[PDB]
Amino acid sequence: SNDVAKVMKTLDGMREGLIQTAVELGSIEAPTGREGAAGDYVYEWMARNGFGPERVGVFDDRFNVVGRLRGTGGGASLSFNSHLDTIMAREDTARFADANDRIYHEAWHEEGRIYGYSVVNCKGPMACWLIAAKALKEAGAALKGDVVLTAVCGEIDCEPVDEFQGHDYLAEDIGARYAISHGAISDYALVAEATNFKPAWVEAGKVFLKVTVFAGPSRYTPYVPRPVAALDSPNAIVRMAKLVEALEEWADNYEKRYTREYGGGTVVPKVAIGAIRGGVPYKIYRFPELCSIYMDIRLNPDTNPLVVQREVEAVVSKLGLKAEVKPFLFRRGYEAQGIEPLQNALEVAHREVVGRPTERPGSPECSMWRDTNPYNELGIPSLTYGCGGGAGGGNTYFLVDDMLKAAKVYAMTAMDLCNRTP
Amino acid sequence: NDVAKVMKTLDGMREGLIQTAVELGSIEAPTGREGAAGDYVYEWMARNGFGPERVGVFDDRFNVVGRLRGTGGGASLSFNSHLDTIMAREDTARFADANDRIYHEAWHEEGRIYGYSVVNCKGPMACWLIAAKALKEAGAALKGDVVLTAVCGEIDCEPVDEFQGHDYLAEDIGARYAISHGAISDYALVAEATNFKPAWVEAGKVFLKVTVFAGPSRYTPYVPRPVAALDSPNAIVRMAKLVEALEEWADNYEKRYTREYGGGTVVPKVAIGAIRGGVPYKIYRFPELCSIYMDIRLNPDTNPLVVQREVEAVVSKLGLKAEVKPFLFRRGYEAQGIEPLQNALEVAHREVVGRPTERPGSPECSMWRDTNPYNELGIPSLTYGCGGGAGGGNTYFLVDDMLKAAKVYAMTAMDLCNRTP
Ligand SMILES: O=C(O)c1cc([N+](=O)[O-])ccc1O
Ligand SMILES: O=C(O)c1cc([N+](=O)[O-])ccc1O
Ligand SMILES: [Mn+2]
Ligand SMILES: [Mn+2]
């Protein structure tokens, strides 16, 4: 009844705490690889507010933080999940025209909006359910089941390859899936990231390909043969340039050919060339005999990675090029099974706070990697839901009013779902 | 055909097979220190031109992945075995004689090769390493690639409480990591010890830490007696009562959740693997708490939370205050779309062994093996090897049997890798 109203009033009074928590958290430097400090904040925040957190991680400076709001007994568990890492590092001048742009690294309340990529993704939705949990506890809401509060590291799609290995470059393998596999299990799970108040419970897989084109023989610049046809060039960089336009057209058709509609959303799987190199910049007097490209290829839940690899091998084959197409990352995407209880609990809350039925999610938010996948993979029916446009968009701010709305929806969802008997 | 040629090659590789298993089995490599074994296999693969790569989370605990590349257009088959062994010389806490011999060494006697390190799992590993060599030296025609995968951390060690990170990790940095970072293929054969009996279902597991509470703490000259066990201020005493209740629950668990699948019969068992409270060097006050650590195997269709509730209920029935906390959960799977590999292996087996395959023993279907990650990731996978399981514990292989296995592995590959995906 009004045990909802009681909590809602409480949250209305926590607006200033909602802001500060988001800003203090968003202000912390925490790109993937250095989320340690961000975790420490969240651990101690949970600690002060009595959620009894544990650090659950593979490395001592890169870990997940898990706390709980324990219930009276006999109810279903709900996890809330957001990630501690952010996209931009001040380091990476190789990816951004202005790696040191204020919006990439800081977070502030102007207006009544909160700006910062670190807030959109993801500190942000995290602040929303942290506050939401605080409300439930202090309003003394009746919950039979546990609320699991899971702040994870390494959600962002950084992966090791070649000589870039270990602690510095790992992400998802030590993130959510690790936390869940080591205790953070629950009946259902809500991943709080930015959709536009549109729930999604399908997500994409991905396979990463390293395509290395071979050529040669190496020649000192005064001996290079000219003129020669591009595809016959001894310079592997030259050949690769030709392979790139062939691959871009293949990609244009890929996303359309493998578009697929699920109940949880329409998956539009896209392809991008994310990195190139060959050979080394500090020794350029001989062109390279080889040159590599690095491809991000998203998968719908029903696409086998090897199928995609053969398609790419075929593009190369059509050009008459000798190349190695080697996969160095594979993760599966999933659509949730048995999602209705969480779907419904959320739907009820959403119509109360936002006012209309929920809409079908935007394709990009269904066609990415979010941590709904590890939960789903492990039998915890899971969806994603939060305010604002995705940072991949790129949105750069949240409205404070919308964040408050979300925190209300999160709390309401919990009060419904956590009072069911499993 | 091109088969007889391979068989004859294998008949001639008998001493290389022995040498490889023994040199491999001789290396100290309990889970947590599989580095040296990883180094050996890499160099073995390098010598035979399989172009290996090291794929790992740490630079001294890694997986080794190589390929025997095909002409093009066939199905890919992985062969998988693990680099770690069960017993460490350190483990005086689990074995009465931690420094035996069978636990740590490996040697050629009869026409046997002895050593737990050989049964599990250097030897089945040797079997397919040799098989690949035979295939390569005989110039066998294969349309599809053969992927050679030696993984770390297969064995069920897991971090818990204060034991975290590098030293205590196992499965999270092993096979699933290797597969997730490149070692993918169409099908996968995990070579571990069955008795030439294929299995393609495997069990999951949930580990529970159960802590019983009591108190108040008392200096020994003040301890209240007599008191009923369940009322003792000593948490150790209460835990002792709970242990018996849990053993009773365990006896019935395995029968209640027994389940037969197409891939084998799963009988999920329960063991109390560890206990502690409090510390041995401050015993003048009994502990207000005491913990137990439970290994509970799950069939593929059991939700871990269900098991947690069953145990919480056991505690509740005794009037005890306890915390039941899970610290490990992994799912077990039955393979889907296994038929092509099942058939390829069956045909090979009948040719080499002479009779049809028999149904696997329940324990080989009801454990953790690396068929689970492959299946989880959509690569249909079964287990097959020679000899009795180390969990048995068998302590040797017959070399004749090891040779038979390598032949089955080789033939399986020649069939499957020439079918169109
Ligand atoms: O949730 C997101 O929008 C999101 C975006 C990126 N990104 O733009 O790189 C990465 C991870 C994310 O979750
Ligand atoms: O594969 C096995 O038989 C096996 C046995 C043990 N064990 O007996 O402890 C552990 C891991 C294994 O894979
Ligand atoms: Mn995100
Ligand atoms: Mn084994």
mmCIF file of N, CA, C and O in Angstrom, chain B residues 7 15 25 52 115 157 216 241 253 287 305 347 350 396:
data_model
loop_
_atom_site.group_PDB
_atom_site.id
_atom_site.type_symbol
_atom_site.label_atom_id
_atom_site.label_comp_id
_atom_site.label_asym_id
_atom_site.label_seq_id
_atom_site.Cartn_x
_atom_site.Cartn_y
_atom_site.Cartn_z
ATOM 1 N N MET B 7 47.990 -45.391 -38.192
ATOM 2 C CA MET B 7 48.075 -46.422 -37.172
ATOM 3 C C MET B 7 49.464 -46.982 -37.051
ATOM 4 O O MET B 7 49.953 -47.225 -35.963
ATOM 5 N N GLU B 15 57.711 -45.390 -27.741
ATOM 6 C CA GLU B 15 58.656 -44.849 -26.767
ATOM 7 C C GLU B 15 58.557 -43.325 -26.615
ATOM 8 O O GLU B 15 58.936 -42.797 -25.584
ATOM 9 N N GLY B 25 54.784 -36.011 -16.484
ATOM 10 C CA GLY B 25 54.243 -36.358 -15.193
ATOM 11 C C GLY B 25 55.206 -36.101 -14.060
ATOM 12 O O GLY B 25 54.804 -35.977 -12.907
ATOM 13 N N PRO B 52 52.625 -22.826 -30.950
ATOM 14 C CA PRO B 52 51.883 -22.551 -29.723
ATOM 15 C C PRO B 52 51.885 -21.112 -29.268
ATOM 16 O O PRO B 52 52.789 -20.358 -29.581
ATOM 17 N N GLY B 115 51.682 -42.987 -11.193
ATOM 18 C CA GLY B 115 51.692 -41.609 -10.746
ATOM 19 C C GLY B 115 50.358 -40.941 -10.937
ATOM 20 O O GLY B 115 49.792 -40.966 -12.015
ATOM 21 N N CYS B 157 40.152 -26.266 -6.897
ATOM 22 C CA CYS B 157 40.602 -25.326 -5.887
ATOM 23 C C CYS B 157 39.879 -24.008 -6.105
ATOM 24 O O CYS B 157 39.654 -23.624 -7.239
ATOM 25 N N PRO B 216 28.617 -16.999 25.020
ATOM 26 C CA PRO B 216 29.759 -16.098 25.093
ATOM 27 C C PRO B 216 31.075 -16.781 25.421
ATOM 28 O O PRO B 216 31.111 -17.784 26.124
ATOM 29 N N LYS B 241 27.502 -31.296 16.115
ATOM 30 C CA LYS B 241 26.164 -31.841 16.014
ATOM 31 C C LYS B 241 25.599 -31.580 14.639
ATOM 32 O O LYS B 241 24.963 -32.433 14.053
ATOM 33 N N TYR B 253 20.518 -36.456 -0.260
ATOM 34 C CA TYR B 253 20.680 -35.553 -1.384
ATOM 35 C C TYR B 253 21.024 -36.268 -2.673
ATOM 36 O O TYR B 253 20.388 -36.048 -3.693
ATOM 37 N N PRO B 287 35.933 -20.977 20.825
ATOM 38 C CA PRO B 287 35.471 -19.996 19.842
ATOM 39 C C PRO B 287 33.980 -19.693 19.924
ATOM 40 O O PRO B 287 33.204 -20.584 20.224
ATOM 41 N N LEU B 305 20.414 -21.879 -5.287
ATOM 42 C CA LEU B 305 19.719 -21.291 -4.159
ATOM 43 C C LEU B 305 18.812 -22.304 -3.506
ATOM 44 O O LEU B 305 18.568 -22.246 -2.322
ATOM 45 N N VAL B 347 32.817 -44.714 -33.955
ATOM 46 C CA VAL B 347 33.361 -45.476 -35.068
ATOM 47 C C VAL B 347 34.830 -45.788 -34.824
ATOM 48 O O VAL B 347 35.261 -46.925 -34.997
ATOM 49 N N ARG B 350 35.299 -48.506 -32.068
ATOM 50 C CA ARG B 350 34.969 -49.879 -32.406
ATOM 51 C C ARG B 350 36.045 -50.461 -33.264
ATOM 52 O O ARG B 350 36.264 -51.664 -33.257
ATOM 53 N N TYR B 396 47.744 -45.860 -12.040
ATOM 54 C CA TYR B 396 48.567 -46.170 -13.205
ATOM 55 C C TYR B 396 47.761 -46.325 -14.489
ATOM 56 O O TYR B 396 46.555 -46.497 -14.465
#
